[PDB]
Symmetry: D2
Subunit: 327 residues, 4 copies
């Protein structure tokens, strides 16, 4: 028996006795992701470039891709009827859903992540996190400011060589590969577990001059092992979604620590760090700032940043013990 | 006035006064590339997972994406009628073409490069180079041992967020985007030129402990600019096709130098290094082992390796100077 | 707000307070239909024809299309968990679903209809009818033998110039167009109503010599109107699904009356006539044998045939009154 | 050994000693055909219905499939560099090509035929014919008034259950299936020949009351064979492209004779009748007005109509005899 994304969420929803609202919300993400995937893959681009003449639009319009993604995501989510608040990376303010379309779920998302790789055609993706609304108050920003630990579902779509959607929930992590011939995601990996230990480390070493001594020491150790084993390989694609997926699936460690340009980290906590930390923990892995668990942080700004270290438990831990040794 | 790959090749053929044999060869390759693209993006994956039933099969028994790619290329090329010898990464020996199907061209390719990335869905590609056959004697392996300087055409397809075909000939480098809705590459970037100086460096820093002193000095300068300029950023996807493409388009440098466990470099001369050296030079860049232009090596074995450093002219030149300083 | 098939069935299901089982069953048809559509449209056919060599399958296998369709349909339905009995046109016996996968719904279907048009590439389609199981007995054939009037949902997919899925239920008829770029059906026509009267008649006149006098008289009247208006146009595609859809959407009348080769009609009652009659009545139209309503017939053979006349009410009626005038 | 349309055209070009101008012309058409196909099958229809938002628009304001088709064809042909005059169904006057873009070929086409079928999703097609330019004077409309006998190439694309391109030249008719997964037509039927005698007749029987006596006699014989043979079956899709294709492949006859409200027939000479007459004759069939081979008419107006009867040689001959018997 083959399992499709659609069927899988449905089955899970019954097991959990849902009213179906969260299930429709998930079905809606899928749609969004398929629509983004098709755009990213450049289908229909011959029109932009004149295959039918440059007479095609009467006035002004073409779209950047992340603008489009954002529109797809927002619009599909509202149409779901499952949400009351949304937080996009592209909006200075939480969007609040009209009462007619208002469900009970808060959704944080990065509609298109890894934009310095968009032009060079490198892997890019979409990041999401779902919360249940925890107040009887009219829906506002505060509803989005919960710790990642209160997540009900999270995950990401990866537009790589193929398109994959990874979904994490209370019971674990599942991967579905998009079949673009029939528009259906297919469970291809079930209940995924990251290796305890890894052989790849992933960090942008260009900030070498600004790392703290923990990260400096750890990096040396990945390259000149004290036990004299083979040094870790290094991979940094530059798209968080890509680097984290490879981390999930081959194991190892991903790092985006604090900097002078950012002393608080670069990556966003609501819609980059959190969901990626939820996925890592559901899969037997760790996600820390160096000092504490990403999921336990209570945000104050929807666009707050945080340092993030995630990956195999022995690897992350090894770095936590350096921070400890140092403090 | 939209220019598709087929038209462009056709015209370039006219200007060259071609017999039309090479043009057909290139048309053939486009077709191989669109076919691999669809396979890589997993159209019809649902059949492999029993959508239609017939579910005994999913086991370690069926054709890998890398093997499929190879077959597509060999067959689509032979069917061209323009080739007499092919070299593939995936075969110990050059394939001699059937006298009946024979043509003058010699083709070296890597049907699918970046196979450490395959399972994690990161970008992967196809690299190729085309030579004119030098001797009059029967077609034999040694027809492929010609230095890169002799390349009549060379380039690659990147399967990334989108699929792209980059093609370099005597008079420049051009980029064509695959519109998978119609099966057609659209020229999106004409006569491409790499910038003189980038701000990104690409290398696997995990081999730090095997690096020669110049590579070592070089990295340091990128991190701690002795002149106080901004430090370069780092990127290493792990797929040559992707790292190189980014280098073409954003500028900067890409390096797979010799190291102790790879005393000759790891990347293959005939179908990885030469193809990308040719693109880089046709685009105003450099490609060097550290002591010598890659294109000038006289090859001695079809699977020979070479150290390769390629990218923007100023960034390669700076490194070469370091190499000179280490006499 | 755009409505997708998925969302539409969901919304309807809640309104009707379903446990969701019938809703998953519908979601499962969709999938099946997308999969059939992609096959029919010939995607991936380059493999059959050797694009990768004729070395591709080790032993014996390619599939006819209606065989495939059948496998898709059966397998997707079982996987739904919504069914206990299925009746395919391709199976001499009702399939009975294993108790582990056994839902409460009986499904009758023609997996691929219009097969004399398959080779000439004319429009083809899939026909379905859903019943609720009406016994507390272990599920057997008798569960499929209900009159069309006990239908809970029915409809068809059309693989024409575009692919459309038409769905009828207690409350009416809705059309969704397949967007093959993102694999999603889009409500494009809502609550469809056939015209009271039409200007097209549709019958295979080649059986002229064997019609009864009712049909003979009616045909003359469509061609030499007694009121002297313009004669109806004639259309017979040869695929029931195509002729009936055009009937639904432009109005008029479709006929496949009794014959000597068939004195009982050609078309099958469980999975051709019934669903097509349910769709016609939900849309303000009529479906008769000449003597009685198709939906009211209680079948005795799952593969029983019946005469069928359907289309605009004034048109069908005009023919009923000829039968009456004659009897 | 798989043969794609591009290869086939290329070779036929070699054998013909072509300049390669006509070959490019045909390549261009393939590209137009794949583009219309995608549009007809409704990829990206979700955008027209506000998936991405921007929902003011769906109203009677945006480009019809028929207009889009026309633009694709004109532009893709002009970009060929092989044409000096085009005739389209959709334009009152021939389009003269810009001297800069000029070539020797004259092209008559029907970008989208069967528009009464468009809304019901029944098959529709694109018909074309190519002439060599006869005079030396400036390119003008009258360059298109050449009898069909002069056609250098002719054929059509059928958008049906699958998309097909049928192409007839001096040395035969071949059929190529579009694999929309890779954007490539595959030759599936080589040197096609219509059978001598079919058992299907195609006509709009609704015009019975305007039919000339021979057509009338003819129909009767198909229904009541005076020799007691089996009666022919009837089929009339309503789209010339589909009815004709079926005629090519199953055999039999297709008829649009003159009738009183269409005293000259309805179908257009330059871009409907000639293109299909040429295919039929190159395939061993006949095409006649009833008194004269269609290809021999000297046309006098680019939108002139003609009565046309085409199909198997025995079935056309039988009808012609009836016409002779009516002196
Ligand atoms: N598809 C699903 N998968 C897993 N849990 C679900 C699903 N649907 C609902 N639930 C659980 O039930 C809770 C209430 O669902 P709902 O009743 O739709 O708001 C959710 O917050 C989930 O924890
Ligand atoms: N499409 C083309 N683009 C650029 N150069 C070409 C093309 N076709 C042929 N040539 C040049 O002309 C030489 C002979 O062409 P051919 O007769 O096809 O072998 C080739 O080796 C190329 O150097
Ligand atoms: N998606 C739906 N649309 C319309 N009616 C439905 C739907 N789902 C369930 N129902 C109605 O509720 C009945 C019981 O549904 P179920 O509880 O799924 O067996 C069905 O037989 C339908 O009449
Ligand atoms: N691809 C082709 N297939 C068949 N005949 C061709 C082809 N190309 C050219 N010809 C024949 O040669 C003539 C001159 O070709 P051209 O130089 O392309 O105008 C054409 O009018 C055709 O009759
Ligand atoms: O170039 P930098 O500073 O390493 O940042 C790249 C990071 O930025 C992001 O685009 C988020 O801004 C991530 O996808 C990625 O990890
Ligand atoms: O893991 P390493 O040693 O850095 O290798 C990366 C290189 O591996 C290769 O796959 C070797 O073919 C290249 O595509 C890529 O540049
Ligand atoms: O050629 P005939 O006898 O008119 O039958 C065609 C009919 O047969 C069917 O294929 C069902 O067998 C219908 O789709 C269609 O209406
Ligand atoms: O409805 P009628 O008069 O039979 O016309 C059918 C004919 O109409 C046309 O659309 C006229 O272009 C043809 O495609 C088709 O053969
Ligand atoms: Mg973003
Ligand atoms: Mg981001
Ligand atoms: Mg390689
Ligand atoms: Mg390889
Ligand atoms: Mg059938
Ligand atoms: Mg049938
Ligand atoms: Mg027409
Ligand atoms: Mg037209």
């Amino acid at each position: 028996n083959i399992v499709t994304l659609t069927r899988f969420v449905w089955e899970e929803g019954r097991k959990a006795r849902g009213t179906g609202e969260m299930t429709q919300l998930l079905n809606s993400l899928c749609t969004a992701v398929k629509a983004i995937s098709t755009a990213v893959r450049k289908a229909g681009i011959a029109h932009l470039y004149g295959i039918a003449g440059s007479t095609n639009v009467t006035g002004d319009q073409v779209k950047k891709l992340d603008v489009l993604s954002n529109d797809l995501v927002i619009n599909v989510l509202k149409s779901s009827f499952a949400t009351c608040v949304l937080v996009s990376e592209e909006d200075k303010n939480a969007i609040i859903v009209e009462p007619e379309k208002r469900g009970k779920y808060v959704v944080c998302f990065d509609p298109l992540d890894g934009s310095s790789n968009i032009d060079c055609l490198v892997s890019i993706g979409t990041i999401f996190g779902i919360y249940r609304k925890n107040s009887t108050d009219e829906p506002s920003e505060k509803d989005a400011l919960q710790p990642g630990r209160n997540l009900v579902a999270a995950g990401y779509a990866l537009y790589g060589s193929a398109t994959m959607l990874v979904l994490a929930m209370v019971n674990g992590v599942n991967c579905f590969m998009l079949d673009p011939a029939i528009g259906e995601f297919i469970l291809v990996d079930r209940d995924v577990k990251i290796k305890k230990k890894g052989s790849i480390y992933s960090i942008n070493e260009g900030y070498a001059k600004e790392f703290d001594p923990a990260i400096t020491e750890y990096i040396q150790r990945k390259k000149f092992p004290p036990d004299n084993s083979a040094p870790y390989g290094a991979r940094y694609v530059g798209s968080m979604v890509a680097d984290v997926h490879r981390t999930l699936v081959y194991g190892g460690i991903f790092m985006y620590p604090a900097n002078k340009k950012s002393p608080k980290g670069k990556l966003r906590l609501l819609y980059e760090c959190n969901p990626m930390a939820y996925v890592m923990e559901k899969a037997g892995g760790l996600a820390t700032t160096g000092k504490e668990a990403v999921l336990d942080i209570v945000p104050t700004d929807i666009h707050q940043r945080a340092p993030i270290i995630l990956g195999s438990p022995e690897d992350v831990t090894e770095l936590l013990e350096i921070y400890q040794k140092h403090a």
